[PDB]
Enzyme design. Structure first.
Site, mmCIF file in Angstrom:
data_model
loop_
_atom_site.group_PDB
_atom_site.id
_atom_site.type_symbol
_atom_site.label_atom_id
_atom_site.label_comp_id
_atom_site.label_asym_id
_atom_site.label_seq_id
_atom_site.Cartn_x
_atom_site.Cartn_y
_atom_site.Cartn_z
ATOM 1 N N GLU A 13 -77.687 -0.729 -137.158
ATOM 2 C CA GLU A 13 -78.154 0.501 -137.793
ATOM 3 C C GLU A 13 -79.626 0.773 -137.494
ATOM 4 O OE1 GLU A 13 -76.523 1.603 -141.528
ATOM 5 O OE2 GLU A 13 -78.450 2.275 -142.338
ATOM 6 N N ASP A 22 -83.476 10.807 -144.028
ATOM 7 C CA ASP A 22 -82.066 10.708 -143.693
ATOM 8 C C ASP A 22 -81.574 12.014 -143.076
ATOM 9 N N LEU A 34 -81.446 4.897 -149.614
ATOM 10 C CA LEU A 34 -81.851 6.185 -150.156
ATOM 11 C C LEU A 34 -82.579 6.000 -151.481
ATOM 12 N N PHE A 106 -70.628 0.887 -144.437
ATOM 13 C CA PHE A 106 -71.913 1.573 -144.429
ATOM 14 C C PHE A 106 -72.091 2.499 -143.234
ATOM 15 C CE2 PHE A 106 -74.610 -1.300 -147.363
ATOM 16 C CZ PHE A 106 -74.356 -0.439 -148.410
ATOM 17 N N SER A 119 -54.617 -0.945 -139.195
ATOM 18 C CA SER A 119 -55.584 -1.870 -138.610
ATOM 19 C C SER A 119 -56.104 -2.872 -139.633
ATOM 20 C CB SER A 119 -56.749 -1.095 -137.995
ATOM 21 N N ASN A 134 -55.874 -2.394 -131.431
ATOM 22 C CA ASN A 134 -55.518 -1.196 -132.183
ATOM 23 C C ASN A 134 -56.763 -0.498 -132.716
ATOM 24 O OD1 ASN A 134 -53.495 0.479 -134.009
ATOM 25 N ND2 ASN A 134 -55.077 -0.354 -135.365
#
Ligand code: ZN
Length: 164
Positions: A13, A22, A34, A106, A119, A134
């Site tokens: 990230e 953001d 946040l 997230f 899955s 998959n």
């Protein structure tokens, strides 16, 4: 060599030690932490100045952002264990594959990861390669190939091998 979830989500990230914004006009800090949907930068450094303990102008250390990240996962999986489909199989894997799950949580969200119903359950029966391939058949995998390949490889091996 000693990897945790916070570091791998710093790989995927991105960690910023200063307050930013953001994608919708809202300040953030660290790794998607946040604070508020308000423009008051004084309210920014005041929420931050009241959550960390030290009064600073929106700049923290790499070990104080990891605190807030641990809070964010301790609430994130507090949400996972209230989702009916994410609850079962998460209780079945090892810590690192659970981190591999919280990463996608997230990344897209609770109902986002809940959509991979087929899955998700092949991980319950521990069908690593099948659930991996998959999972490779996803628009998720195609719009961000790199990160998705890392997460899927950790779903396969249950190791931190792909992030070194
Ligand atoms: Zn099988």
């Amino acid at each position: 060599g000693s990897m945790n979830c916070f570091e791998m989500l710093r790989i995927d990230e991105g960690l910023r030690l200063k307050i930013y914004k953001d994608t919708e006009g809202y300040y953030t800090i660290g790794i998607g932490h946040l604070l508020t949907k308000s423009p008051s930068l004084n309210a920014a450094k005041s929420e931050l100045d009241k959550a960390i303990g030290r009064n600073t102008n929106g700049v923290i250390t790499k070990d104080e952002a990891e605190k807030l990240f641990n809070q964010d996962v301790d609430a994130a999986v507090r949400g996972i264990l209230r989702n009916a489909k994410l609850k079962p199989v998460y209780d079945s894997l090892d810590a690192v594959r659970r981190c591999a799950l919280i990463n996608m949580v997230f990344q897209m969200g609770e109902t986002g990861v809940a959509g991979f119903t087929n899955s998700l359950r092949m991980l319950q029966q521990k069908c690593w390669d099948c659930a991996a391939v998959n999972l490779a058949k996803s628009r998720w995998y195609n719009q961000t190939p790199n990160r998705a390949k890392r997460v899927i490889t950790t779903f396969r091996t249950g190791t931190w091998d792909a992030y070194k």
